[PDB]
Structures are given as structure tokens and as C-alpha cells.
């Protein structure tokens, strides 16, 4: 069921790049986003459901996905979102992390055109920037 489907890092990255090339020839933007998770050990597991869940929010049509990028790291590509409207979407995500409370995390998001137009540089950017 698609509605409660996480995509494994590689599956997620080949679906990010398939995306990446339908953007390109449609003319349309999309946005990435990663959440790291910087809790204790044992807390891991249930901040990693919790913030899971909450990306999956964010999905509005079936394309848009939601990946396990490593053990402590969500990534998120939704389309049609570009810089004028990915603010909105961090701030929802913020605030939903907010209302849990005692999650210590770290947000980055890159749009595509406008932020960049080389999918491994984004990538390679969005991993610095939570690490
Ligand atoms: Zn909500
Ligand atoms: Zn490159």
C-alpha cells in the first residue's frame, strides 16, 4: 500500500532520480528534503516511526516519496514544490517535529531549478548540511 510505503536508500535514490529527469523534461520543480535524527540510542526506534510518519505527510501525489538515506537519516523529494512554497513545507515539518517534543534533529532542503540542476551536487550538499 502506497500509503504507508518507505523506500530503502537505493530504491528511494532511483526513484529520486527517475523524478530528476521527468522535472527536467516537464519544465517542473521539485523539492528534496533530509531530516537526521540526533537522539540517544535508545531512543532511536521511536523517533525513526515518528519522523517517518511525518514525511509521509508531506506526500501529496503517489510520486512523491519518502526514503531511509542511512540509520538515522530520512530523505523526501516532492513535486511541484519550488522555493517559493519549500519554506512552507520545512516549517510544517518543523512544527510537527515541535509537537513531539525532545527530538533533536537538523532540516536542509534543495529545490529543483533554482537551488540546483546537478543531482548528485544536491545530494552530496543536503548530507553535509545535517550532518
Ligand atoms: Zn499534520
Ligand atoms: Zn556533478
Same mark, same amino acid.
Given at each position: 500500500?502506497?500509503?504507508?510505503?518507505?523506500?530503502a536508500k537505493?530504491?528511494f535514490?532511483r526513484?529520486?532520480s527517475?523524478?530528476?529527469?521527468r522535472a527536467?523534461?516537464?519544465?517542473?520543480?521539485?523539492?528534496?528534503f533530509? &531530516?537526521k535524527t540526533?537522539?540517544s540510542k535508545n531512543?532511536? @526506534?521511536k523517533?525513526?516511526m515518528? =519522523?517517518?510518519? /511525518?514525511?509521509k505527510?508531506?506526500?501529496?501525489?503517489p510520486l512523491?516519496?519518502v526514503?531511509?538515506?542511512?540509520?538515522d537519516?530520512?530523505?523526501?523529494?516532492?513535486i511541484? &514544490?519550488g522555493?517559493?512554497?519549500?519554506?512552507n513545507?520545512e @516549517?510544517?515539518?518543523?512544527?510537527? =517535529?515541535?509537537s /513531539?517534543?525532545?527530538?533533536?534533529?537538523?532540516?536542509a532542503?534543495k529545490?529543483?531549478?533554482?537551488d540546483?540542476m546537478?543531482?548528485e551536487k544536491?545530494?552530496?550538499?543536503?548530507?553535509?548540511?545535517?550532518?
Amino acid at each position: 500500500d502506497p500509503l504507508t510505503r518507505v523506500y530503502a536508500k537505493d530504491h528511494f535514490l532511483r526513484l529520486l532520480s527517475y523524478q530528476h529527469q521527468r522535472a527536467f523534461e516537464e519544465n517542473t520543480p521539485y523539492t528534496i528534503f533530509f &531530516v537526521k535524527t540526533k537522539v540517544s540510542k535508545n531512543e532511536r @526506534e521511536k523517533a525513526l516511526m515518528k =519522523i517517518g510518519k /511525518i514525511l509521509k505527510e508531506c506526500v501529496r501525489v503517489p510520486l512523491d516519496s519518502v526514503g531511509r538515506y542511512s540509520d538515522d537519516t530520512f530523505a523526501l523529494f516532492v513535486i511541484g &514544490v519550488g522555493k517559493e512554497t519549500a519554506p512552507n513545507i520545512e @516549517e510544517r515539518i518543523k512544527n510537527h =517535529i515541535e509537537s /513531539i517534543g525532545g527530538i533533536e534533529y537538523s532540516i536542509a532542503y534543495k529545490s529543483y531549478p533554482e537551488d540546483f540542476m546537478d543531482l548528485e551536487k544536491a545530494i552530496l550538499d543536503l548530507e553535509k548540511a545535517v550532518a
